[PDB]
Design a protein around this ligand. Sequence first.
Ligand SMILES: Nc1ncnc2c1ncn2[C@@H]1O[C@H](COP(=O)(O)OP(=O)(O)OP(=O)(O)O)[C@@H](O)[C@H]1O
Ligand SMILES: Nc1ncnc2c1ncn2[C@@H]1O[C@H](COP(=O)(O)OP(=O)(O)OP(=O)(O)O)[C@@H](O)[C@H]1O
Ligand SMILES: NCCNc1nnc(-c2ccc(F)c(F)c2Nc2ccc(I)cc2F)o1
Ligand SMILES: NCCNc1nnc(-c2ccc(F)c(F)c2Nc2ccc(I)cc2F)o1
Ligand SMILES: [Mg+2]
Ligand SMILES: [Mg+2]
Lengths: 289, 289
Amino acid sequence: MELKDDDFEKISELGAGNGGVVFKVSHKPSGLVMARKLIHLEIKPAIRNQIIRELQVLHECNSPYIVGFYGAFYSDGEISICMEHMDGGSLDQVLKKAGRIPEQILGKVSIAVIKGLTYLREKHKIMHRDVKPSNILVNSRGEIKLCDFGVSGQLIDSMAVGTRSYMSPERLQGTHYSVQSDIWSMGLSLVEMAVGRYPIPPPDAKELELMFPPMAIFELLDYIVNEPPPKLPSGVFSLEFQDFVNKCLIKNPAERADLKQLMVHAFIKRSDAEEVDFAGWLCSTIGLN
Amino acid sequence: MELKDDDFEKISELGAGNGGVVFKVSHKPSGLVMARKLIHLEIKPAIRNQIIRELQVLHECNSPYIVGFYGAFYSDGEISICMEHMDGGSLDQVLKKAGRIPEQILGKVSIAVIKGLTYLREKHKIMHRDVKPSNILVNSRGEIKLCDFGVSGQLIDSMAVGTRSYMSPERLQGTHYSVQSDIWSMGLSLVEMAVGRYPIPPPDAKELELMFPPMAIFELLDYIVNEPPPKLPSGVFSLEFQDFVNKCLIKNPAERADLKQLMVHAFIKRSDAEEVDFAGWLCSTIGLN
Ligand SMILES: Nc1ncnc2c1ncn2[C@@H]1O[C@H](COP(=O)(O)OP(=O)(O)OP(=O)(O)O)[C@@H](O)[C@H]1O
Ligand SMILES: Nc1ncnc2c1ncn2[C@@H]1O[C@H](COP(=O)(O)OP(=O)(O)OP(=O)(O)O)[C@@H](O)[C@H]1O
Ligand SMILES: NCCNc1nnc(-c2ccc(F)c(F)c2Nc2ccc(I)cc2F)o1
Ligand SMILES: NCCNc1nnc(-c2ccc(F)c(F)c2Nc2ccc(I)cc2F)o1
Ligand SMILES: [Mg+2]
Ligand SMILES: [Mg+2]
């Protein structure tokens, strides 16, 4: 069934930021609750038909690790992308309430993220381009899924920041980057979730022991590309986790790990085996179940 | 008279970008056409009463070089600032259609900008913080006015980029900046308007003679703060204009000119004297009068 603007009705607001805003909605004809994302774009039909035309591949994106897609349409100065409502929200949201996310949980998250990238890469030849806690969604059935990835070339164009960059050093510096760039973002996202705050600049001995101001725009990006990458603090995280992110956070794209290698790395295999109630931990920490 | 959400009605859309969107509206009770700017802000009453409370000083901002203010209010997840509709739009808009803006015209623009900063500084103790072509408005009565400046401390907080920075080198690097930072932005805005495109990176001999790709985020900001500043191309601009922007675009805030000195600089005095029909040139180039 085709989605239309008038067939919907706002329930509430799930958050926004920079385009760029998302409602919990009701699709009257079907009964389903959906997440509707609105992207404002002043642009000529010609293109904003292409965009819509390029978003249709999302119908073909089926994976337990990819947020489900229902349809996209254009409606007075806004293109709308409708997706599965994930009632757990985004990892950036759960991190606030959680203070920190435990190593075992991030292990399950890492497995999800890696299987998603891999799926998008092998079956569709696409890089995510914007991996970070807020583009990782979770639900009460314990599922972990990626959204907001780079399906639309024309949309990639018609968009191209902030105060916190998850962009790899290479991508920050020039046109010479690609899929390996997603690994860096994942690395940084995990060190963030493991530690409770954006890991750059790294915490000093003082803050370190306490846990266990803003930076200027150039100050930040200059650090990322010219200083050593962040590390998981030692002692309080398995040595396997530490090696995993370290393999992720290597400044040189070709030296950095890729999906193949990360898929068979100690921390994955160990996390793969482990028995955890993510659904349980999630609702426990955010009050839902 | 107080402004309320229901007393308005949309006429059309004047543009948007990053917050951040503006309608030509009709204030039913009064009959006036206004520009209504909507800023989305998920935040607690406590503050978004302060913000509104801090925007009231705009009522006290009266100057032929400052965009007129009618009122601000909050309405379901958006704070609204209502201003004089300027039927000429923004200098970034006129630049597209104009290809280039003539030296004589920029001279009048420079006088306006400088008198505005000066007004905000002397009578209200405030820096603009976001001077660039799109925050300079013009109308058919030939008036040139600044908007979007930093009245609200809490709003300054509750906001803190792109692909084109008009931020001074010092502001890009740290907390150690202030009003002198607006001079840099003005300098760069004029070199942009004089030349027809964002002046960084500077044009090569080839493009230079032809007139007469995107950069990466770090590539750009790194250039700004570590390479020489842009210059007006020689030969085709008065030597006084050249000295004016050069005095503006000096990387060191304390060495850079200030408003006092720019106010009595050759190019100003010369532009001050000159007789030009800005109202005429404006409508001519954008089809209005
Ligand atoms: N399918 C969904 N189900 C549930 N919540 C969602 C869904 N999609 C988005 N959201 C919520 O909406 C918020 C805003 O999404 P959006 O992609 O516009 O911004 P963001 O990714 O958080 O930040 P940025 O836009 O700066 O990258 C997200 O943080 C998430 O909490
Ligand atoms: N008072 C006004 N009268 C006429 N047009 C206006 C007025 N205020 C804003 N506009 C138009 O609305 C557009 C969007 O304004 P807004 O401040 O949201 O974005 P911007 O300043 O262009 O870019 P950015 O938000 O990236 O700084 C402006 O470019 C301008 O053309
Ligand atoms: N303030 C910026 C908001 N962040 C963002 N939201 N959607 C995207 C996005 C970008 C490129 C693209 F091609 C998409 F399909 C995109 N959307 C998208 C892709 C897949 C799914 I499943 C759901 C989506 F919303 O980027
Ligand atoms: N996408 C970002 C949009 N750019 C922007 N629009 N308004 C502002 C602004 C910022 C700080 C502030 F304190 C204001 F009053 C502000 N608004 C404001 C101030 C004076 C006048 I006269 C009119 C205004 F809209 O910044
Ligand atoms: Mg997102
Ligand atoms: Mg503006």
